[PDB]
Amino acid sequence: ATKVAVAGASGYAGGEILRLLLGHPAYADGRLRIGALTAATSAGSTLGEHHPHLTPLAHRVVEPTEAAVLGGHDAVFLALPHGHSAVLAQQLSPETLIIDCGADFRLTDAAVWERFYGSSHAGSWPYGLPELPGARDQLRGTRRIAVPGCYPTAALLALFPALAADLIEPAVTVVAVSGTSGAGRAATTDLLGAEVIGSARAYNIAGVHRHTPEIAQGLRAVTDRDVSVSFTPVLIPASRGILATCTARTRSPLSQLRAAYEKAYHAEPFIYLMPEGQLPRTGAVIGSNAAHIAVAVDEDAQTFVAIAAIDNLVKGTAGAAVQSMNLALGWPETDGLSVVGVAP
Amino acid sequence: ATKVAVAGASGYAGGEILRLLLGHPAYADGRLRIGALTAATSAGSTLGEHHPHLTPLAHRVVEPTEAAVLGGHDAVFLALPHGHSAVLAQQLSPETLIIDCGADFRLTDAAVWERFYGSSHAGSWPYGLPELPGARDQLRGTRRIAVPGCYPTAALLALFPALAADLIEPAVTVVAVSGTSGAGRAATTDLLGAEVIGSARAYNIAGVHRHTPEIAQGLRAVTDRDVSVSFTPVLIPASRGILATCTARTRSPLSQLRAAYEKAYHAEPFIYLMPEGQLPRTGAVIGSNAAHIAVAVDEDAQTFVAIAAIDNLVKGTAGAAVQSMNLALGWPETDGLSVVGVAP
Amino acid sequence: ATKVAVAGASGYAGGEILRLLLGHPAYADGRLRIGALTAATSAGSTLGEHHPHLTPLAHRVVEPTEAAVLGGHDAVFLALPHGHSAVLAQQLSPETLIIDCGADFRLTDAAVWERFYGSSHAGSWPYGLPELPGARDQLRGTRRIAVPGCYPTAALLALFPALAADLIEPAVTVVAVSGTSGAGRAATTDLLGAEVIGSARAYNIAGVHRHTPEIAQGLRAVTDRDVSVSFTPVLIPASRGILATCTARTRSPLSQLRAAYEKAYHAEPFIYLMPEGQLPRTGAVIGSNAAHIAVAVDEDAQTFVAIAAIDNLVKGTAGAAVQSMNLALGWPETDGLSVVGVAP
Amino acid sequence: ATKVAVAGASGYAGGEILRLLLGHPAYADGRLRIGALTAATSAGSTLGEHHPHLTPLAHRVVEPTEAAVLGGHDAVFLALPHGHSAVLAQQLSPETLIIDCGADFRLTDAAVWERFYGSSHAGSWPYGLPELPGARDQLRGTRRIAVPGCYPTAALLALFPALAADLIEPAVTVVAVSGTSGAGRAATTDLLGAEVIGSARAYNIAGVHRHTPEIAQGLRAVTDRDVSVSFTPVLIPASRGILATCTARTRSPLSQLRAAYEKAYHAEPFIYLMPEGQLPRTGAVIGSNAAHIAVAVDEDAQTFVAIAAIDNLVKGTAGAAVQSMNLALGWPETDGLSVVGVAP
C-alpha cells in the first residue's frame, strides 16, 4: 500500500488533505494508509485538538516535522501553503512522491522568485494544475508536484482558453474575492472574526501580491506575447471560496470565445462551463473540487469578462494536491474528489 | 434496484437529499437511480437553475408535483419540511416507500396534533431517528418514514439518555440556535440576507413552536414521569447548523450521567461523545450526518447541561431521511453518510 | 421649519433616511419635523413592525404612498432606489423639495436612458454627489435632487481625480463588492440569508448593469476623451458596504496621481485619503457618510489602482440624500452626518 | 473642562468608548477633552493603525499605560474588559473619576471572587447598571464605577423585574448568544474568522464562566431567597450583539408579569419593552445603547421566558461606561447615547 505522511497537519490545508484522504477509495480498500501527521509546534497533542471535524483521526498524536519522521513514507504532502519547504524537500529521496502546497517550487524564473520572495530560487516542479495545456503530461508518474496558489488557479482557469486561442489581449485584470481560510491558521489581529465579519478589504495591491507573477507565468505559457497582470485580492466575510473576475480587451465575437471554452473544458471533469444566462457562485462549489466558469463580452467596452468560482481549500489547494497525487500514482484522476458542492 | 423520486426538489431539503443520493454507494454501483424531480412551481425549468451545486443533474427538467409524475418510483421523498403531505401520500401507490420530511406523520397524540396544527390528525409513521430507543427496529423494512424535525433531533439526542436513566428531573429546558436554511427556501423579508446577517433573534417562544410537542413526545417514550419542555429557538447568521443547549435539574454524579451517554451511544457511528474538556461546534459537523454531544453538571445550580451540534440539513433532515431509507431497503445504515464535517 | 415625508419608508433606504433624520441637529432643535411615512403595501401597520431599530418612531402608522398623503410636506424623500418615481413626482406640489433615491432623474442622455431602461427619458435633476466637480453649486437651494446610485458613488470618487488630471487612460475597469442591502428589501430567493451567507457571486456582468452608463456619465463630465467602462458588481455576505476596485492604464508617476487626489479631496470632510501604507475597509465606514480612498500604481502592469470603501446605505444612498438636502435647505452640509464608522 | 484618558485604547472597548466620546455633546462644546490614549504594547504607534474608523483621532500617538500618564486627567476609563486593573487604580487619586470596564471591582463577596478569579479581592465599586434598583443612587457623583459584564447586563435586564416582584422562582436559566467582539482583540486560533464564520459553540459551560456569579449577585440584590443561575454562553458568527434567553418557573399570570416590566421600564430611556407580538433582535440595537426586551409565559411548562437584546460593546460595555460617566459628572444621563440601532 501507499503510506502517506502530512507535514503541517494542524493547519487548514493539512486538515483538508486529510478530509479528502479519509474519503478516498484507495483509503477505503487499504491501498492508501495515513501515516505520520506532523507539525512544527504542538507535537504530542492529538489531532482532535486541532481538527474536531476529523473524528476518525481524533486520537492520532501529532509528531514533530522532521525528515526522519517523513522518511519511510511513499508519499509526503508538505501542507504549508505559506511556508518554505525547500530545505525539508532536499532531505527526501527523489523517489518519494512529494506534493508541496507551498510556493517554493512553483516558479520557473529565478530572478522573479528572488524579487518577490527575497531568497535563493530552489527550482521548479511540475505545476499541479492538470487542466492547463501540457500540465497533465508533466504530472503523470512524476515524483514531484508544486501545487498552485489558490488565486492563480481561479484566474488561469478563467483566462487561459481565451489567451491560448489568441482571442484576447495579453494585458489582463483580475479582481478576486476570497474567504479567510486562504490566509491560513496563524493567529493575527487582522484575521480575527470580529475584524473580518461585516467587512471587505483589498490587500497587497498594485502588483506586490506574490500570486501576480504566478498568474503571469501560467499565461505566458499559452502565448508568444508579453503578458501583464493587474491582480487585486479582496478579503470577504466567508470562510471558504474564491470568486475571480477577470477581464481583458478583445476584438473577438462572443460566439468564438464561447467555442474556445467549450473546446477546452468539454472533457474536463472538474471544470463546469455555466449554461448561457447563469453565473458562478462560490457557495455552489464549497467542499467540491469543481471550478464553475462563465464568459461574456462587454461590447461597449470591447472587453472580455470571465468569472471563475472555486473552493480555495479544495481546487485551490488540497483538492489540487489529491488530484495531482492520483495522476502521479496512476490512479483515476477523479478518485476521492467530488464535483458537488455543499450548499447552502 | 430502487428508482427514487424527490417531490419538492427545488427546496433546501430536496437539494440536500439529492446531494446525498449522488454520493451514495448504491448510486455509484447502479442499485439506486434518481428519477423524477418535482416542484409546485417552476415546472419546465432545469434543476441547475435551482441547485447550481448539483451539476451532475443540472440538465434535469423539473416536473409538476403530481401523483402521476411520481408513479413508477420505488421510493418517494416528500421533501417538504414545512408542508403537509398526507393528501399527496394518499395518492401514491401504497407499496411505495414514502419518506415524509414534513410533520404530518410524526406525532402520536391526536389532541396534541390538533392543538398545534389546527387540523385532524392523520396518524403516525415510523420515526426516522434510528438512535432513539426502539426506533431502529420500526425502520427495518418499513415502507413509511416520518423524518424528525431538526430541533427535536438535536434535543432528543442531547437529553434522552439522562432521562431514560432517571438521573435528571423531567422538566427540561432547550435553547437551540439554528442557521437559516432550517426555515426553508420560501422567500420572506425576515429571512433576507441583509436582515439575518449580523443579527440573532428568538422566535416562536414560550411553547408556540410546533417542535415543542415533538420533543416532549420523544422524551415521554423513555420515562414514565410527566415531562414538560420549555423550548426556545434562535436564528443566527449561519446557513446551516443547530447547537442545542439542553438543561434539567439533577443531583446525580456526573460520572453516572456520562455512563448513561456511553450506554446509549458507544456503538452508534453517527453520535460522537466529546473527549473530556472538548465541546461541540456546529462548524465541525457541517456536511456530515454526525451529532457531537457533550455533557456536564453545574453543581452550584444543581443543573445538568447537555450540548448537541448537528447539521440541520443532514442529521436534522436529509441525512436522517437517507439513513432511514437505508434501513427501509436493507442496506448498510451508514451508506452514503459521512461522519466528517467540512471545516472551516 | 421643514416638515419631511418619506415615501417607501418600509424599505432599507427609507429606514436609513429615518435613522439619519432622527440624529440630525435640526431634528433635535425643532427645525426638521418627520411627517408622513408611506409604503405601497402594509398601510395601517406600524413602523416598528418594519424597522424595529427606529424605536422613537415605532408607533407611527404607515400610510399609502399617494400624493394626497404626501401633501403639506416641504420635502419628500422618494426612498425607492429600485423604483421609477417620475409619475409620483409629477403629482406633488412643484414647490416641494423632491429627493429621488431612484434612477429616473439621474441620466442626461435620452438614448442611453432608453437603451438601459426601456422607457422614455424623463429628464435629469441635480445629481446628489456634492464632491463631483460642479455638483455642489447645482445643489445649493435646489428643489430637486437625484440621489446617485451606490456603485457609481464609489467608482466616481475613486476615479474622477485621476481622469480629470488626464493622468490615466479613459478606459476604466471597476469590480465592486457590495453587501446585500443594496439590492433592496424585496424578498427573492437569490437574496435569502441561506443563499447569500458563505457565498459570493458576480451578477449583471459585461455591461448590462444599469449603473455602467451612470459611471460613464460622471467620468465624461471631467474629460473630453472618449470614456469606456467595464463594470462588474459582486454580492458578498455582508449586510452593508461597497469596496470598489478601479483600474486604468497609466504611465504617470504615482506622486502626480496622489497630487490630483489631494487637490480634489483636501477640503472634503467626507472623503478620507488613506495614510501611505493603509488601505480602505468597508467595516471602517459602516454607519458613517465617509468614503475611504487609496491609490497606487502597478508599474509592471502599467496600471493605476484606486480603492474606495463606502457604506452603500449612507454615502451610497441615504447619507447622500441628507447631505444634498442640507445643501438644498441652506444648512451646514455636514449636519447629521458622521465620518466615524461603527466598528468592529 | 473634563480631561479624559482611555487606558487600553487599542482594544475593542477602548475604541468604542472613543467613538462615543467623539459624538458626545460635551466633546462638541469643549466641556470634555480627549487626552492620553494608552496601551500596554504598541506605544509610539498612531491610533489610526488600530482603529481606522476613528479618523478624527487617527494621528494621536498611543502612549504607555502608566499611572503617571493617566494622572493629570479628571476622568480615566480603564478599557480592559478582560484585564485586572486594581494595581493601576490603587495608584490614582480617589478624586479622579475612574471607570473600570474590567471585573476587579464588580463583586461584593471576596470568597466568590477568589474562587472564580484566583486572586485577592480588590473590593467593590458602584455597579454601572443604572437601571438596576438602587444603582442610579449609588452612581450619582461617584468617583468610582465598575462597569458590568456584557452577559450580566442582558440577563439582569431580562430577569430582575420579575424576581423583584416575586413573580418567578429564584432558580434561573440563561442561554445567551454573543458576537465575537466580546472576547476581545487578542489574537487566538479559536477567534479567527475562518473558525467563527459558519459555526456556533457553547463555551465555559456548567457554571465555570465568571459571569455566572455576577448574574447571581445582581439577582440576589432584588430578592430574599437563595438564587441559583445556570448560565451558558454561545459564540455565533456576528461581530456584535448579545441575545439572552432567560427562563424561570412561575406561578404568576402573564398579565401580572407584563405589568411588572411596564412599571420597571416605562420611564427608562434605554430599555424598550417590545409591543405584544414582537420579539427582540440584536440587529436592531447594534451601535445603540438600547436594550430590547420581551416577556412571555409558557403555560404548559409553567415557565417564564424573557428575551433581551443588547449591543455587547455599547450597553454591554462602553455605552454603560459613558452612561455611568454622565451620572457621575451630573450630565444628562442620555448625553452621547442613541437608542437607534444601525440596521440592517
PDB file of C-alpha atoms in Angstrom, chain A residues 115-116 171-173 175 177 190 194-195 197-208 212 228-232 234 236-240 243 245 247 249 279-284 286 294-301 303 305 307 309 344, chain C residues 115-116 171 173 175 177 190 194-195 197-208 212 228-232 234 236-240 243 245 247 249 279-284 286 294-303 305 307 309 344:
ATOM      1  CA  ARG A 115      12.320  39.711  -6.338  1.00  0.00           C
ATOM      2  CA  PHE A 116       9.038  38.512  -4.830  1.00  0.00           C
ATOM      3  CA  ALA A 171      -2.901  42.564 -20.605  1.00  0.00           C
ATOM      4  CA  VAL A 172      -5.328  41.113 -18.072  1.00  0.00           C
ATOM      5  CA  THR A 173      -7.049  42.475 -14.983  1.00  0.00           C
ATOM      6  CA  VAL A 175     -10.025  41.178  -9.049  1.00  0.00           C
ATOM      7  CA  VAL A 177     -12.609  37.894  -3.592  1.00  0.00           C
ATOM      8  CA  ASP A 190      -6.393  41.341  11.030  1.00  0.00           C
ATOM      9  CA  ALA A 194     -14.722  40.473  14.713  1.00  0.00           C
ATOM     10  CA  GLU A 195     -12.466  42.232  12.179  1.00  0.00           C
ATOM     11  CA  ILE A 197     -17.117  39.744   9.769  1.00  0.00           C
ATOM     12  CA  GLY A 198     -19.098  42.545   8.145  1.00  0.00           C
ATOM     13  CA  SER A 199     -16.102  43.952   6.257  1.00  0.00           C
ATOM     14  CA  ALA A 200     -14.287  43.701   2.928  1.00  0.00           C
ATOM     15  CA  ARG A 201     -10.794  44.954   2.097  1.00  0.00           C
ATOM     16  CA  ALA A 202      -8.324  44.789  -0.752  1.00  0.00           C
ATOM     17  CA  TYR A 203      -4.787  43.957   0.304  1.00  0.00           C
ATOM     18  CA  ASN A 204      -1.318  43.579  -1.232  1.00  0.00           C
ATOM     19  CA  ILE A 205      -2.449  45.669  -4.197  1.00  0.00           C
ATOM     20  CA  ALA A 206      -0.747  47.065  -7.323  1.00  0.00           C
ATOM     21  CA  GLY A 207       1.470  44.077  -8.043  1.00  0.00           C
ATOM     22  CA  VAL A 208       3.003  43.310  -4.664  1.00  0.00           C
ATOM     23  CA  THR A 212       0.826  38.095  -9.554  1.00  0.00           C
ATOM     24  CA  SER A 228       0.909  41.848 -17.978  1.00  0.00           C
ATOM     25  CA  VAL A 229      -1.261  41.117 -14.942  1.00  0.00           C
ATOM     26  CA  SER A 230      -3.113  43.564 -12.700  1.00  0.00           C
ATOM     27  CA  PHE A 231      -4.133  41.408  -9.714  1.00  0.00           C
ATOM     28  CA  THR A 232      -6.158  42.685  -6.749  1.00  0.00           C
ATOM     29  CA  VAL A 234     -10.122  41.224  -1.663  1.00  0.00           C
ATOM     30  CA  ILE A 236     -14.562  38.954   2.381  1.00  0.00           C
ATOM     31  CA  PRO A 237     -16.583  37.545   5.366  1.00  0.00           C
ATOM     32  CA  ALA A 238     -16.576  33.930   4.222  1.00  0.00           C
ATOM     33  CA  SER A 239     -14.517  31.052   5.497  1.00  0.00           C
ATOM     34  CA  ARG A 240     -14.007  29.481   2.029  1.00  0.00           C
ATOM     35  CA  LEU A 243     -14.648  34.334  -6.996  1.00  0.00           C
ATOM     36  CA  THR A 245     -13.458  38.409 -12.025  1.00  0.00           C
ATOM     37  CA  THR A 247     -11.039  40.976 -17.846  1.00  0.00           C
ATOM     38  CA  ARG A 249      -9.650  43.759 -24.150  1.00  0.00           C
ATOM     39  CA  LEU A 279     -23.162  32.825 -13.431  1.00  0.00           C
ATOM     40  CA  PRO A 280     -20.841  31.166 -10.887  1.00  0.00           C
ATOM     41  CA  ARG A 281     -21.270  31.382  -7.131  1.00  0.00           C
ATOM     42  CA  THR A 282     -18.694  30.230  -4.615  1.00  0.00           C
ATOM     43  CA  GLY A 283     -21.442  28.708  -2.466  1.00  0.00           C
ATOM     44  CA  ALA A 284     -22.131  26.166  -5.211  1.00  0.00           C
ATOM     45  CA  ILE A 286     -17.737  24.679  -1.460  1.00  0.00           C
ATOM     46  CA  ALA A 294     -18.806  31.831 -17.199  1.00  0.00           C
ATOM     47  CA  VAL A 295     -17.685  34.108 -20.040  1.00  0.00           C
ATOM     48  CA  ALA A 296     -19.167  37.197 -21.667  1.00  0.00           C
ATOM     49  CA  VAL A 297     -18.285  40.163 -23.875  1.00  0.00           C
ATOM     50  CA  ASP A 298     -18.914  43.796 -22.925  1.00  0.00           C
ATOM     51  CA  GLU A 299     -19.437  45.145 -26.487  1.00  0.00           C
ATOM     52  CA  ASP A 300     -19.361  48.842 -25.478  1.00  0.00           C
ATOM     53  CA  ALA A 301     -16.108  48.434 -23.556  1.00  0.00           C
ATOM     54  CA  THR A 303     -13.794  43.813 -23.066  1.00  0.00           C
ATOM     55  CA  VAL A 305     -15.159  39.109 -18.956  1.00  0.00           C
ATOM     56  CA  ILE A 307     -15.828  34.676 -13.877  1.00  0.00           C
ATOM     57  CA  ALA A 309     -15.595  30.235  -8.674  1.00  0.00           C
ATOM     58  CA  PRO A 344     -26.402  26.235   1.039  1.00  0.00           C
TER      59      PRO A 344
ATOM     60  CA  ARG C 115     -31.375  51.591 -24.128  1.00  0.00           C
ATOM     61  CA  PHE C 116     -30.829  50.607 -20.480  1.00  0.00           C
ATOM     62  CA  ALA C 171     -10.891  53.053 -20.492  1.00  0.00           C
ATOM     63  CA  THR C 173     -12.377  48.805 -15.178  1.00  0.00           C
ATOM     64  CA  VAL C 175     -15.012  45.484  -9.840  1.00  0.00           C
ATOM     65  CA  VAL C 177     -18.173  44.086  -3.943  1.00  0.00           C
ATOM     66  CA  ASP C 190     -31.437  34.827  -4.531  1.00  0.00           C
ATOM     67  CA  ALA C 194     -29.069  30.872   3.487  1.00  0.00           C
ATOM     68  CA  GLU C 195     -28.120  31.643  -0.138  1.00  0.00           C
ATOM     69  CA  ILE C 197     -24.208  33.625   3.640  1.00  0.00           C
ATOM     70  CA  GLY C 198     -20.983  31.841   2.761  1.00  0.00           C
ATOM     71  CA  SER C 199     -21.149  32.743  -0.931  1.00  0.00           C
ATOM     72  CA  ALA C 200     -20.027  35.393  -3.407  1.00  0.00           C
ATOM     73  CA  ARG C 201     -21.321  35.957  -6.928  1.00  0.00           C
ATOM     74  CA  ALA C 202     -20.910  38.436  -9.742  1.00  0.00           C
ATOM     75  CA  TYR C 203     -24.137  39.480 -11.422  1.00  0.00           C
ATOM     76  CA  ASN C 204     -25.388  41.627 -14.306  1.00  0.00           C
ATOM     77  CA  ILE C 205     -21.951  41.455 -15.907  1.00  0.00           C
ATOM     78  CA  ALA C 206     -20.395  42.683 -19.173  1.00  0.00           C
ATOM     79  CA  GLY C 207     -22.253  45.961 -19.312  1.00  0.00           C
ATOM     80  CA  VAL C 208     -25.833  45.021 -18.550  1.00  0.00           C
ATOM     81  CA  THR C 212     -22.489  51.231 -16.035  1.00  0.00           C
ATOM     82  CA  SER C 228     -15.430  53.352 -21.675  1.00  0.00           C
ATOM     83  CA  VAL C 229     -16.430  51.472 -18.507  1.00  0.00           C
ATOM     84  CA  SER C 230     -16.207  47.766 -17.719  1.00  0.00           C
ATOM     85  CA  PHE C 231     -18.221  47.358 -14.511  1.00  0.00           C
ATOM     86  CA  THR C 232     -18.656  44.101 -12.558  1.00  0.00           C
ATOM     87  CA  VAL C 234     -20.193  41.183  -6.828  1.00  0.00           C
ATOM     88  CA  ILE C 236     -20.796  39.235  -0.755  1.00  0.00           C
ATOM     89  CA  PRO C 237     -22.066  38.007   2.670  1.00  0.00           C
ATOM     90  CA  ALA C 238     -22.321  41.369   4.399  1.00  0.00           C
ATOM     91  CA  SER C 239     -25.363  43.474   5.049  1.00  0.00           C
ATOM     92  CA  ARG C 240     -23.711  46.805   4.158  1.00  0.00           C
ATOM     93  CA  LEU C 243     -15.475  48.179  -1.817  1.00  0.00           C
ATOM     94  CA  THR C 245     -11.513  48.300  -7.025  1.00  0.00           C
ATOM     95  CA  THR C 247      -8.235  50.348 -12.606  1.00  0.00           C
ATOM     96  CA  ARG C 249      -3.695  52.065 -17.813  1.00  0.00           C
ATOM     97  CA  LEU C 279      -5.937  50.592   2.545  1.00  0.00           C
ATOM     98  CA  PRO C 280      -9.675  51.044   2.902  1.00  0.00           C
ATOM     99  CA  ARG C 281     -12.042  48.598   4.556  1.00  0.00           C
ATOM    100  CA  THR C 282     -15.806  48.668   4.419  1.00  0.00           C
ATOM    101  CA  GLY C 283     -16.026  47.867   8.167  1.00  0.00           C
ATOM    102  CA  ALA C 284     -14.337  51.244   8.975  1.00  0.00           C
ATOM    103  CA  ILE C 286     -20.245  51.397   8.219  1.00  0.00           C
ATOM    104  CA  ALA C 294      -6.358  54.754  -1.513  1.00  0.00           C
ATOM    105  CA  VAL C 295      -4.421  54.923  -4.780  1.00  0.00           C
ATOM    106  CA  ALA C 296      -1.418  53.127  -6.184  1.00  0.00           C
ATOM    107  CA  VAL C 297       0.454  52.296  -9.374  1.00  0.00           C
ATOM    108  CA  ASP C 298       1.295  48.775 -10.617  1.00  0.00           C
ATOM    109  CA  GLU C 299       4.410  49.671 -12.640  1.00  0.00           C
ATOM    110  CA  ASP C 300       4.847  46.186 -14.139  1.00  0.00           C
ATOM    111  CA  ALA C 301       1.258  46.221 -15.435  1.00  0.00           C
ATOM    112  CA  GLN C 302       1.326  49.994 -16.184  1.00  0.00           C
ATOM    113  CA  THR C 303      -1.954  50.180 -14.255  1.00  0.00           C
ATOM    114  CA  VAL C 305      -5.350  51.162  -8.947  1.00  0.00           C
ATOM    115  CA  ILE C 307      -9.755  51.519  -3.925  1.00  0.00           C
ATOM    116  CA  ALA C 309     -14.900  51.996   0.563  1.00  0.00           C
ATOM    117  CA  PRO C 344     -15.988  46.185  14.555  1.00  0.00           C
TER     118      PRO C 344
END
